[PDB]
Amino acid sequence: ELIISDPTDFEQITHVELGDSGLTGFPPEWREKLIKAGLT
């Protein structure tokens, strides 16, 4: 019975895409963010 609002304050934290010259993304330390994310 909880009332869930629509979302606000949308923010994109990390982004990775496939370029013709390997992966790129933001923020510049995205690779550190991925590996740190994979850690428990």
User: Where does this chain bind another protein (CB under 8 A)?
Assistant: 2-18, 23, 25, 30, 34-35, 37-40
Q: Cis peptide leading into 7, omega within 30 of 0?
A: no
Least distance from another protein to the Cβ atom of residue 3, Å:
6
Other C-beta atoms within 10 Å of 8: how many?
5
Least distance from another protein to the Cβ atom of residue 29, Å:
13
Nearer to another protein, 2 or 21 (CB): 2
Which residues are CB-neighbours of 30 under 8 A, at least 6 positions away? 14, 15, 16
Nearer to another protein, 23 or 29 (CB): 23
